[PDB]
Structures are given as structure tokens and as C-alpha cells.
Amino acid sequence: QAQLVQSATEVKKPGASVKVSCQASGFTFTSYGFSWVRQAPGQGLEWMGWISAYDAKTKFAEKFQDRVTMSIDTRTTTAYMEMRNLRFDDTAIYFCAREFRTQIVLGYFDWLEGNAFDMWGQGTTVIVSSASTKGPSVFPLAPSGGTAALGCLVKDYFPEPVTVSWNSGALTSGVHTFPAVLQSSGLYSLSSVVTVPSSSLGTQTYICNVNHKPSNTKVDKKVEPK
Amino acid sequence: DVVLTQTPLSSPVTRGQAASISCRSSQSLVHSDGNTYLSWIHQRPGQPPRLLIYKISKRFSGVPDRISGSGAGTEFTLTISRVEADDVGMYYCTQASQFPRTFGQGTKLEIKRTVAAPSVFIFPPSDEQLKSGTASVVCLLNNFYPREAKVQWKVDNALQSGNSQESVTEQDSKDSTYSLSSTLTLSKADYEKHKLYACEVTHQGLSSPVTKSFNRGEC
Amino acid sequence: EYGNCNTKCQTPMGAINSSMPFHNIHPLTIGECPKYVKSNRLVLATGLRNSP
Amino acid sequence: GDQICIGYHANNSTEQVDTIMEKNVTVTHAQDILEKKHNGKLCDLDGVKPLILRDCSVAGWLLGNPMCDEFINVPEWSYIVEKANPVNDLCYPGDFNDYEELKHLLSR
Amino acid sequence: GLFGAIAGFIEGGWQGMVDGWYGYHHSNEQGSGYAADKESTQKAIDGVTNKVNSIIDKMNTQFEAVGREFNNLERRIENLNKKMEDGFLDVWTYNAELLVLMENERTLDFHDSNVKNLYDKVRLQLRDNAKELGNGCFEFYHKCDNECMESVRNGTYDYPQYSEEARLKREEISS
């Protein structure tokens, strides 16, 4: 099936550079062009430039004109995007979007190979931070008839993400694993909460399972009433 | 450059009702072939965008006939005629008849449900965290709507400022509610120099501000 | 008079904001301009002879 | 007997083109490659505003002809726009030495 | 035209074929209908696109400022500039005009060739399993339902399968 698969995430330091790839498969690579589009945390989509897989011809955005370079390898049906001089602002997801192969199009019939932004890659996260890989500290959030609320505080880790589960994935409803925040220190932190019956405390053992894939740091922490 | 002015930025819509998103271009988008390459894309949280409409009004493969595009010239309109949970996310109008390419600011669709007030909960910092030198005092607003809320931290009746971050969940599929988490961040020094920690919450679903609180060391 | 726009190519009669290879507007241009011709109509065929 | 035919497209186009050997040939699709449209105003050129002198010559503006109101002191421009016959050149009659070359210096 | 097909042995095009540049019209027991050939239409749209884009692309565009900077005692340089200015306009006007006239002939001959090649593609598939009516149509010597017509249109027609049925109908016409 026709698809675009981008490269894995990149953790880079300020001043460094990154080269995200996008591999086409299942369609004629040279029948298409490719726009690069980014999504910064909380921000809307931002066009970065375009490159024809037929021509090698480029088109550029004002903001990235200088520090971005696009290229193409027709033997591995792969499009690339290189960014020089990485900044913090550059922390973002970078999408590779399929588009027109030429700037003048004769779209005279509707089924023709064309249609802009009809196929997207899964995205590549580039993180730009002069912090370094760190496993989280995991602290309990202790509960007080009624609906009881408890949870875990997964703190001071890097990079994203952390997965959180409860009792080896046994408890799922009631749960809320929050999106992480970036602290002033440069490390991320989140908390995972779950509501349960008051008549469970002491009767039921509640443990949050915290995995941080980037450092291979696994931690299970039981939450006891206080 | 072509500017695309998308409106509104925020689109609460009750399940079953219609949503109507507007896109105005600074300038004609008719390409040299007669076609106007004004498109709509949609982005669910945690996924790549997917094409909904191309050429003003044509449905991409897979797209229901309840999703609908219209317009001419410089005013374009996407309507979604009976909204579901899977319709929530960001919507962008986009143009590819000209370089540079342009996107709209974005429109966030969201399910509008009956107002539901948050179950609030405060959490003292564990003894383990007081050993490492810093203090996390967590406030939870569980399962509310609408999104707009105000957390205010108080330490011995003194409003805090610029020492806490909050994170909000994505809207829930079944009950369309949010949760929000405010985290007060202090030193072991400053934590043991006060007694009363209180969390005060203003929401539409409450008539009076609700306050959960605790005294240090008394649990 | 000034009209708060931007071009790559500027004509005494007004601005040309376009990427065609020829234009017939005015010779006394300033910018990255199309090539000036004394022509009313330069039209390339793309489709076929039309019926009947 | 059952049939299959090969054929080609036709439509309601009235777009006409010429060839070396024929004129006014109607075709299904065509493409203009001649720009004929202008916005009818003076714009910035690559992000830099022009210096528009309404009723003044370059000489009037430079020397400070009292009818040539002291300009907003635009610190940078891309080109200069003079009227065809500026009313306010030299108010006291005379000559400007190497004027045309100074004007070309001050163009941008 | 050069290739003899368009406005030649195929008289006139088809208003009823909306979805492509070249294609087919079938007629059998189930009913008649039009179908665009997408391989040859897409190829052609690729070529013509490329043609148009090159005519525009390959133009080299530089920054030039052109005005009238010479005074009343520099009429000889002003005339040197006029001869230059006017000279380039004569060149570009002639090249543009002839370029368009000449590539317009080649584009129409391209379509002619594309149509003739498609006819030859079906010709070579059907062989003697069909009569060649000479107006761009083939009269089949066998029964050809919709799945058979699709096989002609997508280049997988099975000559052997229908070969016998066909020759019995050809033998029969020899009476």
C-alpha cells in the first residue's frame, strides 16, 4: 500500500543539525512532490518548503530559507530535510506531506496523480535541548465513603515519553495520565491519576508501572493511603 | 504571499449538530489550469493530518458525505453536518495553487456537552520527595466541562504566582469531559516555613469557588 | 502613488507579481521581471483539436 | 456483432491556438504564458519601500527646497519614483553638477 | 495530422468521454458505454506538463533596473540604449511567437500519435479475433461481455480463450 514512513525521533543539542528522512513506498516516487510541514508544541501547522521528486526543484519558506536544505534520493525513493543551527523554538514534530511534482499543474482530470497533501508521514519529533537522558523519579499521590482519588508523580525525566500503567495494565477505567510539561530545569514531569471506590483502600493494592524507554529505566511504585 | 484567515479558532459543537468553518484568502487562488487548489485537512490529537476536501468541494476517498466543502473566489466554507467524537481535532484550510504554500491558523473542534463541575482533590508532597529537597503540591480537577477553569494556589492565605504549571487532558470520547492538573513547585526550605496549603477553583459548573486544603504534617 | 504591496517586479503602470516567462505591460521595469514582448497573446496548446 | 472503439476527448472549450501551419484552431485545453495583468500601484521591492517624491526632483529634496517638505527621513529605499515634470526642482535657477550620476547613485 | 488518426481514420472526438484524453467505447449485450484509458492519458499529461514547465522553467531571470538616465546632451548614448532595448524586444518577440507556434504543432501531433498508438495497442491484442472496421472500431468475431472488454482496456485480453469461437465465425462469413 502507498505510504510515507519518516525516520525515528532525534534528540539534538543547540547549534547541532538534524536530517529527517521520509521513505515513499507503494507509488511512483517521481510522480510526486513533497512539502515539509512542522507542528511545534501547542502551535498550528507551518510550511517549511517543497521539493519535486521528478525535478529535484525546491521552493522555500521565508523563515527557513537559510538553515534548511531539502534533497532527494530517487534510488531509495526517499526525501530528506536538513536543518542547520538548531534552536529551542525548533522543538517540534516534522511531517513530510505528499504534493504536486511541478509548480505548473494540468489537473484536467480528477484521478490524475496529483492532489496536494493527500498523503502524510507519521511525523518525526526533533527535540532541541542541552539536557541529557534521565530516568524519572516516581512519587505517590496519597488518598484521604465516596469516590477516592490517587495517583503517581513521574518527575524530572528526559526525553519524552514515559508510559504509565496500573497493576500491569489491569486497571484502565477511571485513569487519567496527563500530558507532560517542560520544567524551567529542562526536564519533563507529569502525573497519572485514577479514581476508585473509598471501600478499596487497604483491600486493594494500587501500583503504577512507569517505563521510560529512552533510558531503559523501569519503576513500580505502590500508592498507600495516609 | 497568500494569507488564509480561518474563523473561528474554537468551535464547540453539540453531538449531532452542525459545525461550519470559514476560510478567507487575501487573494484569488485560481491556478493556471482553471482549478482552485483550496483544500481542507483534519488532524486528530496524536496523529498525522488527513485530507478531507480538495478543489474547494471534492471529497477525498473515505470521507463521509456529511463532510462538505463549498465556496468560490476568496471565501470558502467547510461544514460537518452531524458531528461525532471522531470529528474532534484541528482543521486547517490549505492552498497549493501557488508558492509559498499556506495554511490557516487552525480551528479546534470540540464536543459541547452539558456543563459538568470538577471533582477537586489536593495532594501533599510525599515524604520521599521532601528528602530530595523539593516539594510538589498537586491539585486535580476531575471530569469537568467546559475547558475554562481557574486554579489559584494559596499558602497561608497568600496568593502564589509563577511557581506552578498545569496540564489538561484531551477531551474524553464517551462523556466529553476534561481533567486538569495544577502542580505547585517549591523548596523543602520554603515548604516547611508555611502551614496551610489550599487550592481554590473557579468553574462555570460551580456557583461558589471550591477549596480543598490541608495543613502540613497533619495527615 | 504607494499602495502597501510587495513585488519582485515593478512597472510604471503598476506591479507584476507573477512567474510567467513573458509580459507585454511596460518596458521600463525594475526587478526580477518576465521578458518583455510586443505580444497580445502567447497561448500553448495542451489538449487536442476540439470537435466538431 | 459486439464492438470496441478507440477515440479521443472532446468538450465545450472555445479556447483557440495557432500553429505554424494553421490559425484559430480550437482545443480542449490551453495554457497562457504571457503575463498581461498589473495591480496598478507602486509597491515595495523585495521588502524595501520606494522613495516616492511627489512634486519634487531629487535635487529639490537633497538641497531642501522649502516647498519640498522635510521627508519622514526614510533611512533606506529600493528605487526612486519621480513625477515626469516635478514642479519643485531648483527654486533659485541654476545647475546641479553631475546630477544624472548622483541620481543613479541614490537610486538604491 | 501527421499520424493519420485524429480527424483522419477516426473522424471527430467524443463529447461523451469526460474522464480522459483517449479511451474506449464498447458495445455488447449488456449495454454500451465510455471508458478513459488512464495509462496513456496520464503519460500524455506527464509529457505536456513537462513541456509547459520547461518552456517556463528554463527562462533565466536576472535583476535589471531600466529607466531613462541620460540628459539632453547624451542623445547618442540614449540611442545606443534604444537600439539595445528595441533589439532584445525584437528577439524575444520573435522567439516567443515562433516557439509557441512550433510547439503547438508538436503538441497536436503528439496527441495524434498517442491515439494511433492506442489503436495499434488494441489491434495487436485482438489479432484476427476481431474484424477491423477502419473507422477506429473493431467488430468482434466472438461474444465479448463486460469482463472481456475490461481485459482489452487493461491489456490482458486472452486471445487463445476466444480463438476457436472466432475462427468458426470467420469460416461462417466465407458463406
Place this chain on the structure above:
Amino acid sequence: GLFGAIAGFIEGGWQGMVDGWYGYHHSNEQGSGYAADKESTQKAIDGVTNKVNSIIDKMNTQFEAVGREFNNLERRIENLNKKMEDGFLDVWTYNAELLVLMENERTLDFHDSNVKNLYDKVRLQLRDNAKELGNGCFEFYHKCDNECMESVRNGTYDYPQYSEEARLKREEISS
């Protein structure tokens, strides 16, 4: 040539056909003779006329006065003018020369195509009522008097009328 007819499967042209560019030579009981095809000759003369006229028409001609107006201390401008003058002559000399070389090839291929198309026109009329000798001639399987030859030459040949007489002569050759 490109279309294989002129100086190809038709070896050499006809001195004896004075009244047109392309035509016929018939041979029957009444006698032989040459006849110009006027439709295809007039079409071709229309196209080539149009070609010639456009190559001349489309040239834009302005008034220019060119002399040597610079003095002995203006050699640098005089050389700027020479570079300009010489530059345009190099351009016009190359374009004219290639234009002629290139349109001369297309004109001869045009004639080739015109002749091949005419052959195909008669081919499609006669079908199997005549043998195809392969040198540009058709040997008729029936008796074809002058009014029959005229019907071939003006595109109204009646295949049905002679169809039976023809197949009896083809059947007969199978002995």
C-alpha cells in the same frame, strides 16, 4: 523519411504528374493516366503557405538608425556599441540558420506524412477488394473502369458493389 513513404515504400516521384503534389496513377482496359489529388495537395499548400507567411509575418520590425556617432575619445562607448551590434548579428544569424534547417526537415516529413496518409486513405476504401502490392500500388481483384477509378480518387468507392466479384477472384487465386 520519418513516415516511410516518400523515397521508401514508394521509390521515386512522378515527372508525369504535373498538376499536383500528390495523386494517383490508374491502369485499366480503357488506358492508363495520372490524376492529382486536389484535396490533399490544397491542404498541404495551405499549411506550407501558412508556415512561410508566419516565419516572415511574426518578425517585429522597428525604425532604427545605426551609424558611427562617437569620436576618438569615446572608443569605450564605440566598443560597447560594437559588442551590442555584433552580439545581435550572432543571435539573428544562428536563429535564422537553425530555423531554416529545422523547418526544412519538418516540411519534408510533412510531405512524407501527407503521402502516407493518402495511401492509407485508398487502403481503407478498397479493403480486400484489392491486393496490396507494397510499392504504393493496389492490384484490383475486380474490373475497375474509369468511373470506378474516379470513385477511389474522390472517396466514394462502393465496396459492396464489387465485393462479390472480388472474393470469387480471391477464392480463384487459392488455386
Place this chain on the structure above:
Amino acid sequence: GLFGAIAGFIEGGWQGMVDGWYGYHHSNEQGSGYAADKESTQKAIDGVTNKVNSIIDKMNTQFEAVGREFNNLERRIENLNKKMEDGFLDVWTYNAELLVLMENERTLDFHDSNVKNLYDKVRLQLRDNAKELGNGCFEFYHKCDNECMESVRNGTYDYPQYSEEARLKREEISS
């Protein structure tokens, strides 16, 4: 391509034919093998040579000295020279680029035509003494040793000699 032969009804060329541009591959009792057709390869190499030589020859080359001879108070002439210099580079860059693009299409169509014409040359020699397989090959209805294959390749094939043997094999296939 325009003529339907190269990368059309003949799919792909022949790595094994080292000694020419177009030619033959035979297959009989004695063995198979490749042979270049020298008449049509030499003709084509004549044409393409002539093409290349003309594109180079016809350029008119004059002596020109181009420098920067104007001082700091002659910027207006210096700009007249720049407009001139830059103008001719835009002209020559566009013409060269399009000339190459356009004559590259004609050269490839030339080869296409040359191959189609050769196929038609063998077609016209063999007539019905061979079946036409439609992929560029002829299946012979008779036994054709090496001296027979040479006669096809050098344009002296004797149809009459093999004509009877052939029709007995065609009659036989009608069972």
C-alpha cells in the same frame, strides 16, 4: 515514442547486438544469432552526425574583448553595458537549453522511426510467407536457413521460391 516501435511493440533493446543501432536476431535449425543492419545504422549515424555538426558549425564566432572600462562617474554607461551583457546571456541560455531539449526529442523519435521503417522493410519482403507475431518478430511458414536469413537482411528475399511451401503450411494451420 511517436512511431510506436521503440519501447512499444518492440519492448526493450538488445544488449547482445554490439555492432549497430538497429538490426536483426534470427533463429533456425543451424542456430540463433544477432546481426546489425548496416544500411540503416549508417544512414542514421550520417543524420545524427550532421545534426550535431550543424548545431556547432552554424554558430557565428567573432572577436570580442569584454572588460570593465568605466570609472566611478560612468555608472550609467556601466549599467547600460550590464543590461546588454546580461540580456545576451539570458537569450543564449534560453536558446541553448530549449534547442537541446527540443532536438533531444527529435533524435529519439528519429530512432523510433528508423526502427519502425526497418520492421516495415522486412514486413514488405516476407508478405504472407511469414506470420507476424506482433512483438517485432516474424514466424516463418517455411524453413529458412542462414543464406535465406541473409537474403532478408540484405533486401533480396525471394518470395516466389518459398511461396508454395509457405501456403501449404498456412493451409495446414487451418486444421
